[PDB]
Amino acid sequence: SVWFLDHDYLENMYGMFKKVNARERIVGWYHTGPKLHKNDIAINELMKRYCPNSVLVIIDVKPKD
């Protein structure tokens, strides 16, 4: 339950990206640690605010097969 997503940094990166790419916009968030840590739900709620339907994508640093 100790999770932080700097709102200022998020907004600034959003603005920069849109300025260089208008068509783009937030669609979700991504995290590693294949075992989805229980915090995810809470974090997703934050994203729900930034995007009404924000999807979570878990990526693996080491692919097996």
């Binding site: 849109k18 300025k19 208008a22 068509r23």
Partner: protein, 314 residues
């Protein structure tokens, strides 16, 4: 009170900012070059030509609906990959006595326009058109647009050959005409192997859509015996000779939309000048109106018509 303007202000603060996002987003489209689908080379690639002239081979981007992209279809292509994108295709009786007009013409124009079943059961192809002939003007210039009124549908007025563009354009507009079955093609003032070739479009070239292509015009000096042969030209209607009473009716009709005292001796006026022509009576009315304009008479006095009658008689 001090808050009411703030509420409206908020809508403004967003409004100008609203445009900024719209402007920024709109500030990136690079446009495209417009061209036409010259041919469908393959289900995956097709030959197209930009308006500038160069011709390339391109393909559908994701789903361009090739079923509807038949040879010839406007499409805009990006000038970085040449891919297919959004496609966008870019008075019933004004001649007084019309018994002659409302009779054979009606019975040969609308009868073949309603019940093709009747004739096909008879086994006879419906007549395609009839020819009117007689005095120029009233019978030729006039009552030509009136046919649309009689049938109550919009018609097309068509005014050896240079390149055959006569028949070419006739066929090219034939599909448009057939799209409207009630529509009637009126090739008035129609005037080797184009008129005779003109005899072949009616037989085929999409002439099975229940439309009477009345070749009604005295203009053509040369008359084709094959056309007047039964079938092609079912029958000929001679424009009736004005009897000076139909002239009275025409004057009354045109006298309608005219402001006058009312004590008009219409019979006297018609006897004054034998215009003989509906357009001549139109000129009579116009000249009476002009004479009224002289001295600034909103009405038209009796002598004004007589001057108009005398003037046209010249």
């Amino acid at each position: 009170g001090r808050l009411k303007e703030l509420r409206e202000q908020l809508k403004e603060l967003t409004k100008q900012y609203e445009k900024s996002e719209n402007d920024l987003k709109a500030l990136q489209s690079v446009g495209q070059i417009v061209g036409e689908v010259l041919k469908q080379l393959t289900e995956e690639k097709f030959i197209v030509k930009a308006t500038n002239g160069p011709r390339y081979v391109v393909g559908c981007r994701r789903q361009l609906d090739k079923s509807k992209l038949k040879p010839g279809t406007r499409v805009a292509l990006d000038m970085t990959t040449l891919t297919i994108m959004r496609y966008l295709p870019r008075s019933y009786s004004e001649i007084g006595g019309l018994s002659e007009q409302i009779r054979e013409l009606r019975e040969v124009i609308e009868l073949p326009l309603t019940n093709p079943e009747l004739f096909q059961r008879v086994g006879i192809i419906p007549p395609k058109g009839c020819l009117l002939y007689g005095p120029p003007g009233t019978g030729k210039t006039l009552l030509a647009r009136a046919v649309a009124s009689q049938l109550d549908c919009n018609f097309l007025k068509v005014v050896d050959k240079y390149i055959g563009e006569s028949a070419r354009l006739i066929r090219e507009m034939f599909n448009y005409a057939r799209d409207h079955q009630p529509c009637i093609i009126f090739m008035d003032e129609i005037d080797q192997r184009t008129l005779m070739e003109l005899l072949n479009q009616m037989d085929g070239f999409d002439t099975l859509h229940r439309v009477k292509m009345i070749m009604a015009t005295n203009r053509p000096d040369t008359l084709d015996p094959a056309l007047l042969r039964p079938g092609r030209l079912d029958r000929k209607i001679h424009i009736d000779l004005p009897n000076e009473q139909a002239r009275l009716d025409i004057l009354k009709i045109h006298a309608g939309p005219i402001t006058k005292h009312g004590e008009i001796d219409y019979e006297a006026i018609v006897k004054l000048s034998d215009g003989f022509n509906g357009a001549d009576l139109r000129n009579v009315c116009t000249e009476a109106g002009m004479f009224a304009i002289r001295a600034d008479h909103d009405f038209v006095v009796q002598e004004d018509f007589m001057k108009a009658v005398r003037k046209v008689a010249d």
